[PDB]
């Protein structure tokens, strides 16, 4: 319902209700682990080969065919078994060449459960008895100041949780224009939020074919490893629209032209480095997670008067989200070809 | 209206410099992709591999060192050399052209494609004949 | 080593050839008259180039774990060739040598 002749200065930078939402969802992110398996036993000598592929002398492959010793449902007896892996979840431990991985020498890993799913879903946060929320409906506010026209409510809108450092997906759309928002511009030490109206499509697809393959470590266990790949060994890869890209920063442009002066040059870059995820932008497609170049967007200048774009991505199987010093997580491989649509909603 | 003519010693010793020419018509040296075959008596051909201009110049790696083809553009002939001939090298001999071809399956800009070669015509060929 | 294609005339012939596919393939089909040199009959997986006859179809290289096949109808004398196959599979290796011979005779 709605309110009359009321001002509210609101705040979004020493707001709280964000501050518990961090330590809610990783809270509840923990709690759908500990009834599954964990992966003590699988610490383990590998011994690597290539797989079958044209490889090349100075580009190189991506996949590794691993085969190791492992316990059965019995104590006595061992097997020896194969799987598959990524470069990025080897290292070599120093002829032969035998490696091992990666999180084996800080932590033990936690394989997820593939019954459970990781897909976002709506969230209605409520106020309880003896509370309020307050909600500004002003079309241009820039999210710090006195709103004009608030109006109370039970409980907040959808909401819904993803998981993306670059170029956030699924957002809330504006209302008619292309907001910046932040906290001090003239300051740099604080992210620059950026959220567009028309939103832009974006595919992302593996199209290679897996195959899941299980091993009984012990009782009641279940390692599922990659099996075999049918078809042509090929790379995951996103493709967006170059005219919409080039319409939509023309937008952000004339936006951010009012805070710098008519007369400034405004020009955009890769990112300047650091560890894996935040160089690229990642996300989780159906219960995988992606790690994808971005340089082939941001690569422009704005001066002061049928095709597409593909950038390639990298998958990790183990994740260690939000630098936790004792955590992993395995995530099981997937079936078949895979894709996704998605809508790039704002920028960071 | 092409076709090739070779031509060798016929009897050679082990342990020779083997040398071949091949003669052209209508067709000439720089124009396409050329390409030497062999095949033994009873027995699948043994595609020794191809040659060009500028740089074109892939061998197979079974012989890979006592082998080097060459061209002829005064004379407008295709040449061959092997290097030290064995009693195995008993086998037809076949010059020939080939024409390319971009077998393209996944993103073109991820180099997921692949050139493959098909030899349209074929020459007469010459029996190398190693012996005493 | 040859396998024997005796086919009646008039028949369908269906020669089999190579390793066992992988990926995404194009195979090249050749003949050997006896006594002559080889001739190309197909040069795509099922692409037949200009002034060869006809009824020498192939089949798509999409399929994924089959070995390469070409299919022939109404077969004569002047047909009696060996036959070579010539895979080129997306992962394996260049192939250096051809695949085995399997000779044609005509019933």
């Known amino acids: 319902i709605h309110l009359e002749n009321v001002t509210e200065e609101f705040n979004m930078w020493k707001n709280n209700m964000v501050e518990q939402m961090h330590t809610d969802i990783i809270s509840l992110w923990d709690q759908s682990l500990k009834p599954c398996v964990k992966l003590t036993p699988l610490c383990v000598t590998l011994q690597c080969t290539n797989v079958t592929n044209n490889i090349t002398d100075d580009m190189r492959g991506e996949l590794k065919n691993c085969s190791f010793n492992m316990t059965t449902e019995l104590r006595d007896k061992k097997q020896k078994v194969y799987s598959l892996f990524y470069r990025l979840d080897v290292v070599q431990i120093n002829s032969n060449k035998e490696y091992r991985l990666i999180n084996c020498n800080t932590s033990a890993c936690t394989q997820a459960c593939p019954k459970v799913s990781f897909e976002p879903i709506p969230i209605h946060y409520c106020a309880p008895a003896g509370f309020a929320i307050l909600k500004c409906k002003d079309k241009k506010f820039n999210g710090t100041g006195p709103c004009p026209s608030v109006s109370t409510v039970q409980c907040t809108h959808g909401i819904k949780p993803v998981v993306s450092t670059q170029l956030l997906l699924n957002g809330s759309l504006a209302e008619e224009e292309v907001m910046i928002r932040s906290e001090n511009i003239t300051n740099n030490a604080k992210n620059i939020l950026v959220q567009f109206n028309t939103p832009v499509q974006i595919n992302c697809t593996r199209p290679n074919n897996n195959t899941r393959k299980s091993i009984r470590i012990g009782p009641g266990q279940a390692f599922y490893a990659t099996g075999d790949i049918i078809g042509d060994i090929r790379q995951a890869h996103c493709n967006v629209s170059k005219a919409t890209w080039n319409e939509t920063l023309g937008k952000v442009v004339k936006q951010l032209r009012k805070h710098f002066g008519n007369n400034t040059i405004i020009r955009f870059a890769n990112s300047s480095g650091g560890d894996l995820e935040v160089t690229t932008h990642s996300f989780n497609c159906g219960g995988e997670f992606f790690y994808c170049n971005t340089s082939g967007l941001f690569n422009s200048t704005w001066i002061s008067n049928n095709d597409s774009i593909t950038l390639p991505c990298r998958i990790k199987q183990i994740i260690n989200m939000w630098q936790r010093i004792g955590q992993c997580m395995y995530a099981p491989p997937i079936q078949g070809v895979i894709r996704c649509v998605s809508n790039i909603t704002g920028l960071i | 209206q092409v076709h090739l003519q070779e031509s060798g010693p016929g009897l050679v010793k082990p342990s020779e410099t083997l040398s071949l020419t091949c003669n052209v018509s209508?067709?000439?040296?720089?124009?396409?992709?050329w390409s030497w075959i062999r095949q033994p008596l009873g027995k699948q051909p043994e595609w020794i591999g191809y040659?060009?201009?500028?740089?074109?110049?892939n061998y197979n790696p079974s012989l890979k060192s006592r082998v080097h083809l060459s061209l002829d553009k005064s004379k407008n002939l295709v040449s061959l050399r092997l290097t030290g001939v064995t009693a195995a090298d008993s086998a037809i001999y076949y010059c020939?052209?080939?024409?390319?071809?971009?077998?393209?399956?996944?993103?073109?800009?991820?180099?997921?494609?692949?050139?493959?070669?098909?030899?349209?015509?074929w020459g007469k060929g010459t029996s190398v004949t190693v012996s005493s | 080593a040859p396998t024997f294609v005796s086919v009646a005339p008039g028949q369908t012939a269906r020669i089999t050839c190579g390793e066992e596919?992988?990926?995404?393939?194009?195979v090249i089909w050749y003949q050997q008259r006896p006594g002559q040199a080889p001739s190309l009959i197909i040069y795509?997986?099922?692409?037949?180039?200009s002034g060869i006859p006809d009824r020498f179809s192939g089949s798509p290289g999409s399929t994924f774990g089959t070995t390469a096949t070409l299919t022939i109808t109404s077969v004569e004398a002047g047909d009696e060739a060996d036959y070579y196959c010539?895979?080129?599979?997306?992962?394996?290796?260049?192939?250096?040598?051809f695949g085995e011979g399997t000779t044609l005779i005509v019933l």
């Open positions: 209508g067709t000439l040296v720089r124009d396409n992709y």
């Open positions: 795509n997986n099922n692409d037949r180039p």
């Open positions: 596919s992988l990926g995404s393939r194009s």
């Open positions: 020939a052209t080939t024409k390319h071809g971009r077998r393209i399956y996944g993103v073109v800009a991820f180099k997921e494609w692949f050139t493959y070669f098909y030899m349209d015509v």
């Open positions: 010539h895979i080129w599979d997306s992962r394996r290796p260049t192939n250096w040598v």
């Open positions: 040659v060009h201009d500028s740089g074109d110049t």
